[PDB]
Design an enzyme around this catalytic site. Structure first.
Site, PDB file in Angstrom:
ATOM      1  N   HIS A  40       0.792  -1.216   0.000  1.00  0.00           N
ATOM      2  CA  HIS A  40       0.000   0.000   0.000  1.00  0.00           C
ATOM      3  C   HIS A  40       0.836   1.284   0.000  1.00  0.00           C
ATOM      4  CE1 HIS A  40       0.166  -0.026   4.557  1.00  0.00           C
ATOM      5  NE2 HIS A  40       0.281   1.248   4.318  1.00  0.00           N
ATOM      6  N   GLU A  52      19.149   7.487   7.885  1.00  0.00           N
ATOM      7  CA  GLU A  52      18.435   8.671   8.386  1.00  0.00           C
ATOM      8  C   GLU A  52      18.210   8.611   9.885  1.00  0.00           C
ATOM      9  OE1 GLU A  52      17.868  11.369   7.107  1.00  0.00           O
ATOM     10  OE2 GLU A  52      17.049  11.303   5.064  1.00  0.00           O
ATOM     11  N   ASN A  54      17.247  12.418  11.676  1.00  0.00           N
ATOM     12  CA  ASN A  54      16.376  13.530  11.359  1.00  0.00           C
ATOM     13  C   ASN A  54      16.168  13.595   9.852  1.00  0.00           C
ATOM     14  OD1 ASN A  54      15.303  16.165  10.819  1.00  0.00           O
ATOM     15  ND2 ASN A  54      15.861  16.697  12.951  1.00  0.00           N
ATOM     16  N   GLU A  62      23.637   9.692   5.718  1.00  0.00           N
ATOM     17  CA  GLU A  62      22.622   9.306   4.769  1.00  0.00           C
ATOM     18  C   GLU A  62      23.198   8.723   3.495  1.00  0.00           C
ATOM     19  OE1 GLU A  62      22.984  12.437   6.075  1.00  0.00           O
ATOM     20  OE2 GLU A  62      21.084  12.997   6.993  1.00  0.00           O
ATOM     21  N   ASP A  84       0.111  -7.647   1.884  1.00  0.00           N
ATOM     22  CA  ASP A  84       0.543  -6.248   1.875  1.00  0.00           C
ATOM     23  C   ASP A  84       2.052  -6.144   1.984  1.00  0.00           C
ATOM     24  OD1 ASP A  84       0.509  -3.478   1.818  1.00  0.00           O
ATOM     25  OD2 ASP A  84      -0.378  -3.257   3.826  1.00  0.00           O
ATOM     26  N   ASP A 171       1.182   2.346  19.769  1.00  0.00           N
ATOM     27  CA  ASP A 171       0.848   1.755  18.453  1.00  0.00           C
ATOM     28  C   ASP A 171       1.713   2.409  17.365  1.00  0.00           C
ATOM     29  OD1 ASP A 171      -0.686   0.173  16.660  1.00  0.00           O
ATOM     30  OD2 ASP A 171      -2.518   1.247  16.988  1.00  0.00           O
ATOM     31  N   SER A 172       1.683   1.795  16.192  1.00  0.00           N
ATOM     32  CA  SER A 172       2.145   2.466  14.995  1.00  0.00           C
ATOM     33  C   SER A 172       0.962   3.367  14.497  1.00  0.00           C
ATOM     34  CB  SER A 172       2.607   1.420  13.974  1.00  0.00           C
ATOM     35  OG  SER A 172       1.572   0.480  13.679  1.00  0.00           O
ATOM     36  N   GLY A 175       2.013   7.267   8.540  1.00  0.00           N
ATOM     37  CA  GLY A 175       3.386   7.587   8.193  1.00  0.00           C
ATOM     38  C   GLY A 175       4.386   6.525   8.614  1.00  0.00           C
ATOM     39  N   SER A 177       3.619   3.330   7.977  1.00  0.00           N
ATOM     40  CA  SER A 177       3.342   2.284   6.999  1.00  0.00           C
ATOM     41  C   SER A 177       4.599   1.811   6.306  1.00  0.00           C
ATOM     42  CB  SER A 177       2.400   2.796   5.912  1.00  0.00           C
ATOM     43  OG  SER A 177       1.070   2.740   6.232  1.00  0.00           O
ATOM     44  N   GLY A 178       4.698   0.499   6.134  1.00  0.00           N
ATOM     45  CA  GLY A 178       5.781  -0.101   5.426  1.00  0.00           C
ATOM     46  C   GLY A 178       7.027  -0.371   6.217  1.00  0.00           C
TER      47      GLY A 178
HETATM   48  C1  LIG Z   1      -3.460   1.505   5.473  1.00  0.00           C
HETATM   49  C2  LIG Z   1      -2.516   2.163   6.267  1.00  0.00           C
HETATM   50  N1  LIG Z   1      -1.698   3.098   5.787  1.00  0.00           N
HETATM   51  C3  LIG Z   1      -1.829   3.477   4.481  1.00  0.00           C
HETATM   52  C4  LIG Z   1      -2.797   2.916   3.624  1.00  0.00           C
HETATM   53  C5  LIG Z   1      -3.638   1.930   4.184  1.00  0.00           C
HETATM   54  C6  LIG Z   1      -2.840   3.334   2.255  1.00  0.00           C
HETATM   55  C7  LIG Z   1      -1.947   4.221   1.759  1.00  0.00           C
HETATM   56  C8  LIG Z   1      -0.933   4.801   2.591  1.00  0.00           C
HETATM   57  C9  LIG Z   1       0.027   5.725   2.146  1.00  0.00           C
HETATM   58  C10 LIG Z   1       0.967   6.197   3.019  1.00  0.00           C
HETATM   59  C11 LIG Z   1       0.905   5.788   4.358  1.00  0.00           C
HETATM   60  N2  LIG Z   1       0.017   4.931   4.831  1.00  0.00           N
HETATM   61  C12 LIG Z   1      -0.897   4.451   3.959  1.00  0.00           C
HETATM   62 CA   LIG Z   2      18.881  13.297   7.693  1.00  0.00          CA
HETATM   63  O   LIG Z   3      -1.390   5.310   7.310  1.00  0.00           O
HETATM   64  V   LIG Z   4      -0.098   4.265   6.864  1.00  0.00           V
END
Ligand SMILES: c1cnc2c(c1)ccc1cccnc12
Ligand SMILES: [Ca+2]
Ligand SMILES: [O]
Ligand SMILES: [V+3]
Length: 223
Positions: A40, A52, A54, A62, A84, A171-172, A175, A177-178
């Site tokens: 996603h 990274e 800051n 970096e 995902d 929690d997470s 931002g 994500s991933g």
């Molecule tokens: C679930 C959680 N985070 C996201 C999404 C769905 C979809 C897009 C996205 C883009 C950047 C950051 N988080 C998300």
């Molecule tokens: Ca930096």
């Molecule tokens: O997100």
């Molecule tokens: V997200």
């Protein structure tokens, strides 16, 4: 990351920021040429930023390397967030040292109760918005499949796990994500989804990386 702590510069040396003019997702460096992130988080024009702390200051450690290819999992379903996961190939190999290092893929899945390290530059509030410039960290346990399924009935597949605290507070968040979920020195999760952030009975949901090692290895073998 809501309810976490400042990691300390370069103490999470596999953490990446994905940048498309701005930070929009995390990721994890798995070898000198490849990053794992969430499907996603796909977009065109990704630059991977390694080393990274800051994200708004060039501090001296970096490496900024453009993606040459992004590969979303073949079975990714953006409606359910099943599968995902995405691989990102770097245009040039990262230089690996103490401030930039890869994280091992799992051989076996992690156990419930294992304390994991989740990290990112996402929102630090459960209500309202505040984005940190330096990398945040959170220690969080993997939850039972049954507690996960009770929290999100009808939504949890075999390719997902919950981690965190049913009481809320940690929690997470947006931002993150991933980004990584690291348990006993292996990349076991990818920050995937949740229901808000740090709400009671709504822990974070994570891609179960151990179910993808065959696909990862095969993909890296041919790209
Ligand atoms: C679930 C959680 N985070 C996201 C999404 C769905 C979809 C897009 C996205 C883009 C950047 C950051 N988080 C998300
Ligand atoms: Ca930096
Ligand atoms: O997100
Ligand atoms: V997200």
């Amino acid at each position: 990351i809501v309810g976490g702590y400042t990691c300390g510069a370069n103490t999470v040396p596999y953490q990446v920021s994905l940048n498309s003019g701005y930070h929009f997702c995390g990721g994890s460096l798995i070898n000198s040429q490849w990053v794992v992130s969430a499907a996603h988080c796909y977009k065109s024009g990704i630059q991977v930023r390694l080393g990274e702390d800051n994200i708004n200051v060039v501090e001296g450690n970096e490496q900024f390397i453009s993606a040459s290819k992004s590969i979303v999992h073949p079975s990714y379903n953006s409606n359910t967030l099943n599968n995902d996961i995405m691989l990102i190939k770097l245009k040039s190999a990262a230089s690996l040292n103490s401030r930039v290092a890869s994280i091992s893929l799992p051989t076996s899945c992690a156990s419930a109760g294992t304390q994991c390290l989740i990290s990112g530059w996402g929102n630090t509030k459960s209500s309202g918005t505040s984005y940190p410039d330096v990398l945040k960290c959170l220690k969080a346990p993997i939850l039972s499949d049954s507690s996960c399924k009770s929290a999100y009935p009808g939504q949890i597949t075999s390719n997902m796990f919950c981690a965190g605290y049913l009481e809320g507070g940690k929690d997470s968040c947006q931002g993150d994500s991933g980004g990584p979920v690291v348990c006993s020195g292996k990349l076991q999760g990818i920050v995937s989804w949740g229901s808000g952030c740090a709400q009671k009975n709504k822990p974070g949901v994570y891609t179960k990386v151990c179910n993808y090692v065959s696909w990862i290895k095969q993909t890296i073998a041919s790209n």
